[PDB]
Design a protein around this ligand. Structure first.
Ligand SMILES: CC(C)C[C@@H](C=O)NC(=O)[C@H](CC(C)C)NC(=O)[C@H](CC(C)C)NC(=O)OCc1ccccc1
Lengths: 240, 317, 229, 196, 225, 201
């Protein structure tokens, strides 16, 4: 009844100078569960809330390892995230083999941006439906990066992606000044609090539903799940 | 057999034929099919196959379909028929599904509508879940065709409403979901009209506290049957979901409030979580085309709650 | 009942305005309409139970097998046509041996399910698979969706009545369940969906235990289990 | 080294082969069969480099068997020999060249008995009699001296025995037993092995 | 989906083929339809030898059958070249089913459109009968039928098949003839019968031989009356 | 390297030495020269150690895929042909592998010799390696089909020992395996030094 002739393909440009399919793909990240990433002077932490098909089911893994110094959290289509994760792991291993140097995180995010851009400009290709929050430590320092289905990438002091992400972003912006000087324990607590804002009032963060990944000057990327998240979870105050 | 019984007719001002009559023949077959309704059962199954072929052939040829004795054969067909069609169902099951569909799409005399409903109510009470699911499927075609005749009988409208609502609280998930599908279609065609009593019944069922205790933890128990409280909550959400699905392309004044209720039940344990996710996802897809007109009905606060909902499938995240 | 079609449904590789891919979702649902398969994982062992549904007496029951052995320690239960899953079952079997040649070791069930998922990604794939095996971690059960998502499930049901079976499975399942109790529960749930008396032709039962390799119950062994019910 | 011989009489083709398979200095097998049954009335005898003989002969056998399944009628012995020659010739200039010396013996209802000699260089010649191996130099003369176009099948067995007896007396190599087969209108018939 | 259903319609219209698995003999019988007044019957076969130990009967599109039979025959020789052993009846059926699953082109009538009854003996000497479908599903059957009247023939076979029926080679041949005789009405004029035997080449019985077996079954029926 | 196998009334006996030598250096005295492809099939390794190990391991992988795919074990004849085909593709490229595939299958006890050159042969008795000539004579003089199991075990041990005494590249211990209808059984591992005292005594 209100059909649009210009939304059929990523190649078609609308008369308003917008590509509709890229915008539709950008909405795919919002379908995925909320993920919060924040950084301090010495550490970068990604905190994500997993969801499960059934009580018996284990829970999907939002956070993945890319390299010793780089870790990513996925929101949006999981299959696209697996393709991107495999590409990122190969680039990092190549950098260690050729230069014996951890690949700078900024160069990796640029390569992901190039790979994502080609589906947007070519026929019969869907733009990737996954948004990635990337946590890394390099010579420059701890870095948090956001990638979009549009192929744009952003350096962020802190970012939240997924459903109800805006509530987390309002908390992250409110307390961002405190984040730079925070110790690892406090920085993780701030991320859990932002993720808590996304959660509905009845639901609360649990060891089963929360995944935390932290990279730092002396810490290789480590994913803490289930019992491992319990020390970080115990410190957090009760929901306001 | 259809040709032998063709001369018998219910046409006006007709004397009884000297040729063979269908009611007498069905009565003999019904007595012979009583054991299935071990050697006796096997002999009956072969008879059932032949009679099923006759009913399939007689669906279009017979001047009057739905002879009262023929209606009595329907319960046996309901149990035999498969819930999901497949080519590995052994022929008799596949034929029973085809026969039920042909019989369901049949003109029913106004006198026959009370009798057919009574058979349908009895099979709905039957233990077999397949029969209860099949009765809902038979009812959907039987009500849409011959829609005005059923509507003319107010008692039929009340009985059909009760059967669908009663099947909504059934133990099997597949029957419960089919009952919601039937209610959504019946509300859509206006055969069943959404009413304040209907919504109150669904809201009361939805607000039923979960037991919050596990029989398995003490152990020495085998509770295969699902908890009644979980079934009651699911029936209420299935009912509210059917009301949302009734208007696919339009948002009526009652729709925003029901959607707000459905959002609250999103975190409830499965199978309630799956039902709310599917209803909301289907609402979003159908209502995207004319969203600007649809958005006006929702208040700004109501729109925010709907926007911040994760109804995504497992493949997403 | 009444048709409810939207312009963005059935668009192949086109994102809907919401960002969902509708044609993929419809395909995945059609794939899950196959015969019911139930897997329960217990500390003692992992048990897989499936319904054969043989059409005629003349047909040999063994020829239709819905439970296959990926390797001695891993078995797979499938819902839907065996032909659709033949390529994926073969990939898992080739990978398990390819891993053994390269690293001289057994491949964990999670790694095996990931390899089958990678083939599915490289396209719905048309099958839902339950991989059950005992590895270094212990007895473990994984569910592979037609989409290709793989999760570890303590108890999972795939097939036409999977949603009903899963609710029944949730109530019956407990962490301390013995393998013998698990076999009885899965068969009791399978009987309820089937609505047919259980017989050796009707159901196929396989178990993988920590000491033992993949074992498929023989007609006599299944008959003893069904009689106890 | 390995010895093959064939005598084509008026109504038959008689073929014999040494039955010894050997490593560098030791005879691994004394029961080896160097004759491959390509078809009901065609026998291929192949000797030559290790590996090349088994692989090439088996490939020709499978293709001739395929022709029978596809068309329902067997290849003529002349056609089978020509198919073998073309395949060997194509491989000659290929990266993989088969060093195989072959004798093809066959009976065609239309053309009667046929014996073909093919060297490693894939040159095909129809012959009343031919032999392969170092022993062929010693035995070709005996066959030349006593062979007659109308020789009887019993006399042909006697002539073959005389060539085999010559190998034992003058050949440096030990070839104790020989596999003897005769092809006729009735079909390939195995004959008692000549042993010394 | 639609293509698979179209293929199934083609097989249903095909000439009836019935096969029985017996202790020492596997029998394949196919009905032979009339051709034309001036046509030659040698070209029409419907029973083909895939290899020395394997035989196939097909119901469905003739052109598609030729491609599948040729590909199967080349595979049997390739298997013998690689492994040195005769192909197992199950292995050849699996290959034909895979070929049916993919025609090698996207779309392009991917189901081949022929349903095949494959009968033969394994290297072990076990008699085997298998059925291939346009879907690519392959099953093993003691007895089965494909083509016109297959469902009616199967029910006759289910009642008739017994240890006594398969006791002797002549009785197994007679069982195939009786089942074919229901779908196709005539004596030896409209029936083609092939007997694999054990460790022996496939033999297609001559018209005189099939008539003698047909005569015997009629005499038994008269005695039964 | 001396490896011997013979088929007798009670099954197939497979025997091997344990010495791996780089040049004249004895690198190893504990090498296992018989690989267990499956519970009913064994493979003997002679020639270059890496060439035989990689190719026999590849055959073992193929045999397991055959068992999984066809639900039946591979025949000794099929396994022997598969190894012959793989080595033949690399013929003339310097692979040195002499192997005996010994197993029990539906046909019965089976012995096949496969070579890097491409020879594949089946026989009751086979010996492969540098010490094969020494093993062949002792085995041939004392071999009979009717030999009892204990007599057969002694013949295999003696043939390897005499071969080790004469051959520099053969030595270590005599590993003995007996293929039986139930399956292969490892029999005994005896140092040639212990064997020397028993035989000389
Ligand atoms: C495992 C068995 C197959 C080995 C068996 C077979 O003959 N016995 C052997 O003696 C074989 C035969 C070889 C001398 C041709 N020995 C070997 O294969 C030995 C292996 C040792 C170095 C660990 N020689 C070898 O492989 O050369 C590798 C090498 C290359 C350069 C320098 C030093 C060593």
């Amino acid at each position: 009844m209100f059909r649009n002739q210009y939304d059929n393909d990523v190649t078609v440009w609308s008369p308003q100078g917008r590509i509709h399919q890229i915008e539709y793909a950008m909405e795919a990240v919002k379908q995925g569960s909320a993920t919060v990433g924040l950084k301090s002077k010495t550490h970068a932490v990604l905190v994500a809330l997993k969801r499960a098909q059934s009580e018996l089911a284990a829970h999907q893994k939002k956070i993945l390892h890319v390299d010793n110094h780089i870790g990513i959290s996925i929101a949006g289509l999981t299959a696209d995230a697996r393709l991107l994760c495999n590409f990122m792991r190969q680039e990092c291993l190549d950098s260690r083999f050729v230069f014996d140097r951890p690949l700078p995180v900024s160069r990796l995010v640029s390569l992901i941006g190039s790979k994502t851009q080609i589906p947007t400009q070519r026929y019969g290709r869907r733009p990737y439906g996954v948004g990635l929050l990337i946590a890394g430590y390099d010579d420059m320092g701890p870095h948090i990066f956001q990638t979009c289905p549009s192929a744009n990438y952003f350096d962020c002091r802190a970012m939240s992606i997924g459903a109800r992400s805006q509530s987390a972003r309002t908390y992250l912006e409110r307390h961002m000044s405190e984040f730079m000087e925070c110790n690892l324990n406090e920085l993780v607590k701030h991320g859990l609090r932002a993720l808590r804002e996304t959660l509905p009032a009845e639901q609360d963060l649990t060891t089963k539903n929360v995944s935390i990944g932290i990279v730092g000057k002396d810490l290789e990327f480590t994913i803490y799940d289930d019992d491992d998240v319990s020390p970080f979870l115990e410190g957090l105050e009760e929901r306001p | 057999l259809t040709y032998i019984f063709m001369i018998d007719v219910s046409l006006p001002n007709t004397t009884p034929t000297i040729s063979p009559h269908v009611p007498e023949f069905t009565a003999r077959i019904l007595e012979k099919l009583k054991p299935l309704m071990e050697d006796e059962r096997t002999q009956g199954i072969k008879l059932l196959k032949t009679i099923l072929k006759w009913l399939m052939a007689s669906a279009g040829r017979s001047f009057s379909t739905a002879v009262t004795e023929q209606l009595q054969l329907l319960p046996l067909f309901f149990k035999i028929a498969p819930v999901e069609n497949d080519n590995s169902y052994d022929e008799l099951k596949r034929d029973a599904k085809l026969c039920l569909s042909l019989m369901s799409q049949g003109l029913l005399y106004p006198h026959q509508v009370p009798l057919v409903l009574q058979v349908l109510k009895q099979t709905a009470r039957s233990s077999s879940w397949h029969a209860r699911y099949t009765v809902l499927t038979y009812l959907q075609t039987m009500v849409f065709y011959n829609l005005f005749i059923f509507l003319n009988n107010e008692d039929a409208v009340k009985d059909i409403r009760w059967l669908v609502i009663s099947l909504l609280e059934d133990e099997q998930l597949e029957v419960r979901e089919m009952a919601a599908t039937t209610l959504s279609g019946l509300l859509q065609c206006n055969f069943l009209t959404m009413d304040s009593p209907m919504q109150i019944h669904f809201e009361q069922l939805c607000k039923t506290k979960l037991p919050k205790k596990r029989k398995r933890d003490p152990g020495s128990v085998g509770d295969t049957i699902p908890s009644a409280e979980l079934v009651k909550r699911h029936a209420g959400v299935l009912g509210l979901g059917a009301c949302v699905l009734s208007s696919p392309y339009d948002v009526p004044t009652w729709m925003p409030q029901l959607l707000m209720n459905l959002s609250a039940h999103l975190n409830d344990p499965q199978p309630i979580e799956m039902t709310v996710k599917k209803t909301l996802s289907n609402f979003r897809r159908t209502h995207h085309d004319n969203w600007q007109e649809h958005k006006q009905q929702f208040t700004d606060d109501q729109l925010l709650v709907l926007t911040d909902l994760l109804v995504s499938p497992c493949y997403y995240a | 009942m009444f048709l409810t079609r939207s312009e963005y449904d059935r668009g192949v590789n086109t994102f809907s305005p919401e960002g969902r891919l509708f044609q993929v979702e419809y395909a995945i649902e059609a794939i899950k309409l196959g015969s019911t398969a139930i897997g329960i994982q217990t500390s003692e062992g992992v048990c897989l139970a499936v319904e054969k549904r043989i059409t005629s007496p003349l047909m040999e029951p063994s020829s239709i097998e819905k439970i296959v052995e990926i390797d001695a320690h891993i078995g797979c239960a499938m819902s839907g046509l065996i032909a659709d899953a033949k390529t994926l079952i073969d990939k898992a079997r080739v990978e398990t041996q390819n891993h053994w040649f390269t690293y001289n070791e057994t491949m964990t069930v999670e790694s095996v399910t990931q390899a089958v998922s990678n083939l599915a990604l490289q396209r719905p794939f048309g099958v839902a698979l339950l991989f059950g095996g005992v590895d270094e971690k212990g007895p473990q059960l994984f569910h592979m969706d037609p989409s290709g998502t793989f999760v570890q499930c303590d108890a999972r049901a795939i097939g036409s009545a999977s949603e009903g079976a899963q609710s029944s499975l949730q109530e019956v399942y407990h962490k301390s369940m013995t393998l013998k109790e698990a076999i009885k529960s899965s068969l009791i749930i399978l009987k309820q969906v089937m609505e047919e008396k259980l017989n050796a032709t009707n159901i196929e039962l396989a178990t993988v235990q920590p000491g033992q390799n993949f074992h498929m119950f023989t007609k006599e062994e299944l008959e003893e289990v069904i009689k106890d019910i | 080294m390995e010895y093959l011989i064939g005598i084509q009489g008026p109504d038959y083709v008689l073929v014999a082969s040494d039955r010894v398979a050997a490593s560098n200095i030791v005879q691994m097998k004394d029961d080896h069969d160097k004759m491959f049954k390509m078809s009901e009335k065609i026998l291929l005898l192949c000797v030559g480099e290790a590996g090349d003989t088994v692989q090439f002969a088996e490939y020709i056998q499978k293709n001739v068997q395929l022709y029978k399944m596809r068309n329902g009628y067997e290849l003529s012995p002349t056609a089978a020999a020509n198919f073998t020659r073309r395949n060997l010739a194509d491989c000659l200039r290929s990266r993989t060249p088969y060093h195989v010396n072959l004798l093809l013996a066959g009976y065609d209802e239309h053309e009667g008995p046929a014996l073909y000699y093919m060297d490693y260089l894939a040159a095909l010649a129809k012959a009343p009699f031919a032999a392969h191996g170092y022993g062929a130099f010693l035995t070709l003369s005996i066959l030349d001296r006593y062979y007659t176009p109308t020789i009887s099948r019993e006399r042909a067995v006697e002539l073959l025995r005389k060539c085999l007896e010559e190998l034992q007396k003058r050949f440096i190599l030990n070839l104790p037993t020989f596999s003897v087969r005769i092809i006729d209108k009735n079909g390939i018939h195995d004959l008692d092995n000549i042993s010394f | 989906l639609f293509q698979v259903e179209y293929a199934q319609e083609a097989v249903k219209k095909g000439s009836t083929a019935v096969g029985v698995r017996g202790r020492d003999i596997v029998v394949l019988g196919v009905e032979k339809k009339s051709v034309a007044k001036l046509q030659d019957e040698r070209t029409v076969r419907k029973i083909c030898a895939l290899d020395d130990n394997v035989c196939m009967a097909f119901a469905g599109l003739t052109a598609d059958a030729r491609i599948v039979i040729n590909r199967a025959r080349v595979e049997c020789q390739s298997h013998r070249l690689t492994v040195e052993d005769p192909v197992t009846v199950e292995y050849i059926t699996r290959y034909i089913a895979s070929l049916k699953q993919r025609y090698t082109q996207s779309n392009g009538r991917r189901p081949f459109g022929i349903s095949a009854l494959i009968v033969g003996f394994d290297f072990d000497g076990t008699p085997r009968l298998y059925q291939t479908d346009p879907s690519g599903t392959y099953h093993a059957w003691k007895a089965n039928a494909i083509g016109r009247g297959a469902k009616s023939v199967r029910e006759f076979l289910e009642k008739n098949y017994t240890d006594e029926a398969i006791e002797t080679d002549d009785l197994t041949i007679k069982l195939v003839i009786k089942a074919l005789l229901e779908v196709v009405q005539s004596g030896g004029k409209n029936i083609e019968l092939a007997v694999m035997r054990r460790d022996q080449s496939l033999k297609i019985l001559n018209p005189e031989e099939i008539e003698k077996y047909v005569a015997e079954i009629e005499k038994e029926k008269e005695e039964n009356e | 390297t001396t490896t011997l196998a013979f088929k007798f009334r009670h099954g197939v006996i497979v025997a091997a030495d344990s010495r791996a030598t780089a040049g004249a250096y004895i690198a190893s005295q504990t090498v296992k020269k018989v690989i267990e492809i499956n519970p009913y099939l064994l493979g003997t390794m002679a020639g270059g150690a890496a060439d035989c190990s990689f190719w026999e391991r590849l055959l073992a992988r193929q045999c397991r895929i055959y068992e999984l795919r066809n639900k039946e074990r591979i025949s000794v004849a099929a396994a022997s042909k598969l190894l012959a085909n793989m080595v033949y593709q690399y013929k003339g490229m310097g692979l040195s592998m002499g192997t005996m595939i010994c197993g029990w299958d539906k046909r019965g006890p089976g012995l096949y010799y496969v070579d890097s050159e491409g020879n594949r042969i089946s026989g009751a008795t086979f010996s492969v390696g540098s010490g094969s000539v020494y093993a062949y004579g002792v085995m041939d003089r004392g071999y009979s089909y009717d030999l009892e199991v204990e007599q057969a075990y002694d013949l295999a041990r003696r043939a390897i020992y005499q071969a080790t005494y004469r051959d520099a590249y053969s030595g270590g211990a005599v590993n003995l395996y007996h293929v039986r209808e139930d399956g292969w059984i490892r029999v005994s591992s005896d140092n040639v030094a212990d064997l020397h005292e028993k035989y000389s005594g």
